[PDB]
Ligand binder design. Sequence first.
Ligand SMILES: [Br-]
Ligand SMILES: [Mn+2]
Ligand SMILES: [Mn+2]
Lengths: 198, 201
Amino acid sequence: AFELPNLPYGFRALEPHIDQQTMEIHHDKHHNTYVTRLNAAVEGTDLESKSIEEIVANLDSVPENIQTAVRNNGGGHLNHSLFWELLTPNSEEKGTVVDKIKEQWGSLDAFKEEFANQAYARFGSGWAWLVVNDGKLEIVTTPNQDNPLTEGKTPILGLDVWEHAYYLKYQNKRPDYISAFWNVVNWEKVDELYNAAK
Amino acid sequence: AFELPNLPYGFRALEPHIDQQTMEIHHDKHHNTYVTRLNAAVEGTDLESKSIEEIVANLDSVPENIQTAVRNNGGGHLNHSLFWELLTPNSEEKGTVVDKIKEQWGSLDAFKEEFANQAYARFGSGWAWLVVNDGKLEIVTTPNQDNPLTEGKTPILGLDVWEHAYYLKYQNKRPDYISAFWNVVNWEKVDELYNAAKHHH
Ligand SMILES: [Br-]
Ligand SMILES: [Mn+2]
Ligand SMILES: [Mn+2]
């Protein structure tokens, strides 16, 4: 069965960029619900032994009757699992991917502009991603809990732009949330995900 | 140009079922953004003189360069315009549609159960609707700001299940929001929309 991973920090560790009420409800309620419904679908099937990454990457090996449950709750589990590890109270804009971003976009600032534009433009619920696409850094967004793995793209940074991720602190103000996010990005985790793509 | 409609009650009128902070932000910010972007898309074109009902029912015909903006922002404008008039501080569970619902589902409660189930199951952003679909009552849900009119179904009740509609008061507890919603449904508006639906064509 899949396990709800602990946050790597206390609920208050990302203040004042993300509020502790959100960190608690987002993790203990929203992510936990994805794990409940994912397990209800996959527990007792030949998918149960597989990594969530293998499953989400290969949704056409999911039998038709649970395909939607797995895509949505499997996606929910993978996306939130990545997100918690991609946040930190000790953010430093350094390392492999930051250097590659400066190289490709000319500056980290230009990168943040495009990331924020794409994240802002995602209509309804979804995610903004920095992915590796056959060696190439690319910014994409996905609806709901869809994940670039399914399209053969390796996610190395993700921002949750479902309203549950920002409404308590920021309400309608998604751009302020996106701006706040830069303060808590775990670039060490980004580097790890990038290195494993290779 | 399209206009943000005035609420027919105060921001506090739907308490405790919908919180005044949400009523103000949802109307003055979320709906207003849809109106702004609809107007940015259509102003100075032949679409500016058409009803939002006509535009949304006919998204297929909207020029390709503005079709997504009109689908999302025109949808947004129609959906919220319907929603405000379908809420009331003076809800009475009676009339033509309540009577038809009792006949079809056997009780209002059985109807509420199916509606609440579909509204809860809608994954991500969207709307739960009661529609007239070729003369029969049908519960459907739509993603984002999509509207049953585009598929030739007439909406007579809608519930916003975007998280902005419920997160400040209910957070993750969408079912408690849906439960609250019944206390503020304007069945007089539902009756009016139904009656129009029967004579649409
Ligand atoms: Br801590
Ligand atoms: Mn989330
Ligand atoms: Mn809304």
